[PDB]
Amino acid sequence: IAIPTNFTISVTTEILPVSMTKTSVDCTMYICGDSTECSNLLLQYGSFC
Amino acid sequence: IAIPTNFTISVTTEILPVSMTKTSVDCTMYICGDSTECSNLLLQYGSFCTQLNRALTGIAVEQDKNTQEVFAQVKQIYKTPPIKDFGGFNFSQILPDPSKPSKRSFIEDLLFNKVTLAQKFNGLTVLPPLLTDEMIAQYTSALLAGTITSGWTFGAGAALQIPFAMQMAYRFNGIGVTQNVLYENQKLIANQFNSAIGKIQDSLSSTASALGKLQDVVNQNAQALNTLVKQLSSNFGAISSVLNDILSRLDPPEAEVQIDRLITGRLQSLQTYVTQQLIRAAEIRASANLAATKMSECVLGQSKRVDFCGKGYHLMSFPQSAPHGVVFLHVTYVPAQEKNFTTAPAICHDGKAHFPREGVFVSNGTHWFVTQRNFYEPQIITTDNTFVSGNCDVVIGIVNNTVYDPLQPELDSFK
Amino acid sequence: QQLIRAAEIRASANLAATKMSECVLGQSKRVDFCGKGYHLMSFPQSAPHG
Amino acid sequence: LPPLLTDEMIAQYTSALLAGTITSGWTFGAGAALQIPFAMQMAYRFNGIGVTQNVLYENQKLIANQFNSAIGKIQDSLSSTASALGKLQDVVNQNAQALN
Amino acid sequence: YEPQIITTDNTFVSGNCDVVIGIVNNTVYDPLQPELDSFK
Amino acid sequence: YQDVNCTEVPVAWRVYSTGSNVFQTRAGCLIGAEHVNNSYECDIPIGAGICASYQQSIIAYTMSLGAENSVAYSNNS
Ligand SMILES: *[C@@H]1O[C@H](CO)[C@@H](O)[C@H](O[C@@H]2O[C@H](CO)[C@@H](O)[C@H](O)[C@H]2NC(C)=O)[C@H]1NC(C)=O
Ligand SMILES: *[C@@H]1O[C@H](CO)[C@@H](O[C@@H]2O[C@H](CO)[C@@H](O)[C@H](O)[C@H]2NC(C)=O)[C@H](O)[C@H]1NC(C)=O
Ligand SMILES: *[C@@H]1O[C@H](CO)[C@@H](O[C@@H]2O[C@H](CO)[C@@H](O)[C@H](O)[C@H]2NC(C)=O)[C@H](O)[C@H]1NC(C)=O
Ligand SMILES: *[C@@H]1O[C@H](CO)[C@@H](O[C@@H]2O[C@H](CO)[C@@H](O)[C@H](O)[C@H]2NC(C)=O)[C@H](O)[C@H]1NC(C)=O
Ligand SMILES: *[C@@H]1O[C@H](CO)[C@@H](O[C@@H]2O[C@H](CO)[C@@H](O)[C@H](O)[C@H]2NC(C)=O)[C@H](O)[C@H]1NC(C)=O
Ligand SMILES: *[C@@H]1O[C@H](CO)[C@@H](O[C@@H]2O[C@H](CO)[C@@H](O)[C@H](O)[C@H]2NC(C)=O)[C@H](O)[C@H]1NC(C)=O
Ligand SMILES: *[C@@H]1O[C@H](CO)[C@@H](O)[C@H](O)[C@H]1NC(C)=O
Ligand SMILES: *[C@@H]1O[C@H](CO)[C@@H](O)[C@H](O)[C@H]1NC(C)=O
Numbered sequence: 219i220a221i222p223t224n225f226t227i228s229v230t231t232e233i234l235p236v237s238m239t240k241t242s243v244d245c246t247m248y249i250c251g252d253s254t255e256c257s258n259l260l261l262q263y264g265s266f267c
Numbered sequence: 268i269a270i271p272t273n274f275t276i277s278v279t280t281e282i283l284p285v286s287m288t289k290t291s292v293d294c295t296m297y298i299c300g301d302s303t304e305c306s307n308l309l310l311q312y313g314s315f316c317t318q319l320n321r322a323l324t325g326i327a328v329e330q331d332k333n334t335q336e337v338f339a340q341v342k343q344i345y346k347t348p349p350i351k352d353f354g355g356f357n358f359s360q361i362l363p364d365p366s367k368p369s370k371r372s373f374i375e376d377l378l379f380n381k382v383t384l385a386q387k388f389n390g391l392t393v394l395p396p397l398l399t400d401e402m403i404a405q406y407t408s409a410l411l412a413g414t415i416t417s418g419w420t421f422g423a424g425a426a427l428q429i430p431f432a433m434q435m436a437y438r439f440n441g442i443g444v445t446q447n448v449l450y451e452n453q454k455l456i457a458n459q460f461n462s463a464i465g466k467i468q469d470s471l472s473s474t475a476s477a478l479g480k481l482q483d484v485v486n487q488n489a490q491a492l493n494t495l496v497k498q499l500s501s502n503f504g505a506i507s508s509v510l511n512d513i514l515s516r517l518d519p520p521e522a523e524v525q526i527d528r529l530i531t532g533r534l535q536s537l538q539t540y541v542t543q544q545l546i547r548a549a550e551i552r553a554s555a556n557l558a559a560t561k562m563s564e565c566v567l568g569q570s571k572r573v574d575f576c577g578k579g580y581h582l583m584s585f586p587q588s589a590p591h592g593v594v595f596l597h598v599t600y601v602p603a604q605e606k607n608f609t610t611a612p613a614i615c616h617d618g619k620a621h622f623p624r625e626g627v628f629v630s631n632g633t634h635w636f637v638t639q640r641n642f643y644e645p646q647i648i649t650t651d652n653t654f655v656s657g658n659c660d661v662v663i664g665i666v667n668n669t670v671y672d673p674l675q676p677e678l679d680s681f682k
Numbered sequence: 683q684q685l686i687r688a689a690e691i692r693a694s695a696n697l698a699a700t701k702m703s704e705c706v707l708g709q710s711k712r713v714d715f716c717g718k719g720y721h722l723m724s725f726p727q728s729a730p731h732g
Numbered sequence: 733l734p735p736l737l738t739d740e741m742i743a744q745y746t747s748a749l750l751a752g753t754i755t756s757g758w759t760f761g762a763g764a765a766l767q768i769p770f771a772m773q774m775a776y777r778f779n780g781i782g783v784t785q786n787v788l789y790e791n792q793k794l795i796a797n798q799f800n801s802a803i804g805k806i807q808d809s810l811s812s813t814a815s816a817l818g819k820l821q822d823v824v825n826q827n828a829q830a831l832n
Numbered sequence: 833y834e835p836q837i838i839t840t841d842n843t844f845v846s847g848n849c850d851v852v853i854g855i856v857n858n859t860v861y862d863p864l865q866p867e868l869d870s871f872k
Numbered sequence: 873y874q875d876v877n878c879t880e881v882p883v884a885w886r887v888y889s890t891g892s893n894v895f896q897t898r899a900g901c902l903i904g905a906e907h908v909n910n911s912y913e914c915d916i917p918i919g920a921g922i923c924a925s926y927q928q929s930i931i932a933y934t935m936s937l938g939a940e941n942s943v944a945y946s947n948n949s
């Protein structure tokens with residue numbers, strides 16, 4: 219048998235992500251942009267946005 | 268130091284979703300809907316509909332797999348004896364009630380009545396679950412009967428009988444409290460358990476927003492299906508959203524374009540629906556895995572992991588069934604009414620240092636005793652509850668006292 | 683893509699909560715769950731997103 | 733959008749957890765916090781791994797010195813290393829890249 | 833299953849015989865008495 | 873045939889639609905299997921607690937959860 223006669227105290231680091239940035243996008247400003255004709259055309263595509 | 272002098276028994280509830288409604292959508296019936304021209308044009312796009320059907324079928328099978336994993340964990344169907352002598356503990360509100368229809372209990376009836384809220388459409392079908400609600404109730408009844416009658420023995424091999432008070436003494440011993448505390452306080456512990464169980468039904472009777480997760484899942488699925496159905500009244504740039512009007516009011520060669528314009532949009536809608544369904548199914552599968560782990564580790568045994576099953580020191584747990592999920596009632600031990608003492612790490616006597624075997628040294632101001640670490644029960648410092656190692660000039664915090672030798676009086680009086 | 687990534691972030695957060703509960707508020711007997719060796723204790727610190 | 737909990741609040745939570753574990757042990761995770769001298773709590777924790785109390789009490793100075801030295805080394809490792817955070821940065825990159 | 837004789841070495845005493853519900857009367861053997869009788 | 877009355881099956885191979893062995897379950901209409909009063913472990917899941925197996929010919933039964941067992945509980949045993 220083998221038996222230890224001394225010891226050591228060790229400190230170890232662990233890193234874990236918990237969240238990410240909250241980002242927001244809207245269609246009408248991204249797809250068309252302050253344009254009535256484009257938004258009227260986009261209204262024919264239902265409720266994707 | 269501070270040491271508690273009393274305790275409370277607390278039961279708490281945890282809600283977990285395990286399953287989700289099994290739905291099926293026919294690709295060609297949804298896209299075309301009784302039109303040979305549309306079907307012949309849709310034949311040109313390859314095998315998108317086969318992939319969509321395969322994905323939905325896999326999602327449907329996964330739900331039955333989840334339910335079987337969570338609930339079908341007992342080999343036999345155990346029953347409770349007709350005579351109920353459990354040391355004063357009253358399980359009447361969680362055991363099956365057979366006067367009323369079905370084999371449900373009082374709390375299960377409350378849960379099923381609380382969670383309350385489609386129709387036949389063009390290509391939409393809903394498949395029934397493999398296990399009815401009665402079979403799930405019967406699994407839960409078997410688990411309760413086993414855990415009440417045999418302890419944790421039925422989870423490893425065959426069930427072995429044990430009186431309930433002795434089982435609960437085992438469970439106190441498993442959290443660091445000796446068997447004295449239970450047998451001398453049996454009536455109080457039973458009363459506290461009964462009162463907490465009675466409070467559970469009051470808490471979940473008047474209040475309704477407790478079952479938030481199950482209703483959230485139901486609402487999300489209903490909203491997704493409603494949006495998919497409503498997307499059928501968009502022309503996507505064509506002249507109309509109805510194929511009959513397009514076919515009647517236009518001849519084929521320039522009706523091809525309008526039909527293609529409708530087909531592309533309807534395909535896109537179906538694909539986005541299927542993708543979000545896959546993601547939601549993955550989330551539900553993770554939840555069901557957690558629920559199965561909790562059933563295995565907290566109903567079929569006693570858990571040492573902190574906060575895994577309730578707040579406090581875990582004593583035991585009971586399962587109940589819900590419309591599309593499971594409910595866990597965790598019974599835990601909470602110390603209370605702490606008192607304040609002064610301590611020492613070791614005691615020097617005859618030039619030797621003594622340490623406690625299983626407790627701590629305390630004093631009420633003048634005299635020193637040894638106590639448990641979780642309940643105040645002082646005792647005289649003898650040589651039977653301490654062990655000696657070394658001299659008393661190396662430990663920081665030594666105090667002087669005397670260690671009783673029980674053999675000295677008997678071998679002095681009788682020599 | 684954002685939804686698929688958020689699922690993984692949520693899994694990491696659940697693991698972090700379990701470690702906070704079982705290693706800072708108690709002593710753990712699970713092998714290699716908190717460090718390499720025999721666990722004695724743990725201390726938390728905050729990071730910009732973790 | 734800004735997160736609901738700011739950095740000072742998270743630091744307060746971390747400080748509360750650290751003070752509770754240093755002063756009470758594991759008692760504050762079940763009910764009210766019960767005070768305990770630190771050396772006796774470390775003796776409890778040695779009993780928890782199969783080593784007796786006298787081993788702690790007769791080598792207290794050495795154990796304290798080893799702990800202090802390890803804590804000192806960890807900050808040198810953090811400061812000198814070029815990139816030890818790793819995963820935390822990686823997530824950020826991904827998001828930014830997708831946005832671009 | 834491995835039965836033993838009930839002695840003061842495998843049991844511990846605490847309290848009276850009134851508080852506990854299912855008490856059973858029996859005897860607890862004392863290992864010291866035989867040698868104390870044989871060696872005064 | 874999923875969620876359909878057994879009546880209007882043949883109106884909308886022709887031997888697997890006749891009224892020889894016709895059973896009305898809750899998952900739909902089943903043709904070609906005999907309905908027995910026994911219960912066994914599930915073999916092929918049909919649904920709503922109904923399973924099917926091959927035992928001679930094909931049979932359809934209600935799933936059995938397991939074997940009954942009453943533990944000899946007593947307060948001093
Ligand atoms: C056990 O032995 C004691 C003394 O050796 C004896 O008193 C007990 O007999 C009865 O115990 C009852 C305790 O439940 C007590 O209420 C009753 O008065 C007592 N009878 C007499 C005549 O004293 C013994 N117990 C049993 C069960 O025989
Ligand atoms: C157990 O290990 C410790 C750490 O190495 C030893 O303590 C060292 O002893 C040497 C020689 O006496 C000193 O030069 C070091 O400064 C000590 N280290 C510390 C941190 O104090 C200890 O002697 C060992 N115990 C044995 C071998 O029985
Ligand atoms: C421990 O707490 C319990 C309360 O749960 C105490 O029991 C109560 O005692 C008061 C005063 O004697 C009674 O009015 C209550 O009816 C008791 N409650 C129950 C449920 O019986 C108990 O006395 C406490 N123990 C100590 C040593 O103080
Ligand atoms: C366990 O508790 C139930 C109540 O939750 C007790 O049932 C009540 O018993 C009293 C007296 O017999 C009746 O007046 C009530 O109408 C019962 N309530 C219900 C809902 O049935 C039951 O008696 C308790 N168990 C024991 C052994 O006393
Ligand atoms: C600490 O506890 C001891 C033991 O319970 C107390 O000593 C007893 O005190 C009472 C009342 O004065 C006497 O009747 C007993 O004879 C004492 N027992 C002894 C001396 O063995 C002591 O008073 C307590 N000290 C406090 C509460 O400050
Ligand atoms: C605890 O007991 C030791 C041993 O008796 C005490 O140490 C002695 O104290 C007396 C005075 O009371 C001195 O005359 C002796 O020289 C001391 N040493 C020895 C070996 O006897 C000690 O004072 C007591 N109290 C404390 C707090 O340690
Ligand atoms: C002893 O502990 C109690 C808490 O139960 C505390 O209120 C009291 O101040 C303490 N005694 C001191 C600090 O002298
Ligand atoms: C505890 O601290 C006090 C200072 O208030 C000091 O006098 C005493 O020696 C210390 N005791 C131990 C055992 O560290």
Ligand SMILES: *[C@@H]1O[C@H](CO)[C@@H](O)[C@H](O)[C@H]1NC(C)=O
Pocket residue numbers: 352853854947948
């Ligand atoms: C067991 O129950 C019977 C019947 O109620 C009773 O006479 C007996 O005293 C009980 N035994 C114990 C140990 O509680």
Ligand SMILES: *[C@@H]1O[C@H](CO)[C@@H](O)[C@H](O)[C@H]1NC(C)=O
Pocket residue numbers: 876877896
């Ligand atoms: C169709 O099946 C249902 C369900 O069993 C039944 O109630 C009904 O009588 C059957 N026939 C018709 C014409 O609906």
Ligand SMILES: *[C@@H]1O[C@H](CO)[C@@H](O)[C@H](O)[C@H]1NC(C)=O
Pocket residue numbers: 907908909
């Ligand atoms: C099964 O039993 C019921 C009575 O419970 C009876 O009406 C029915 O005909 C039986 N089925 C067969 C196939 O014998």
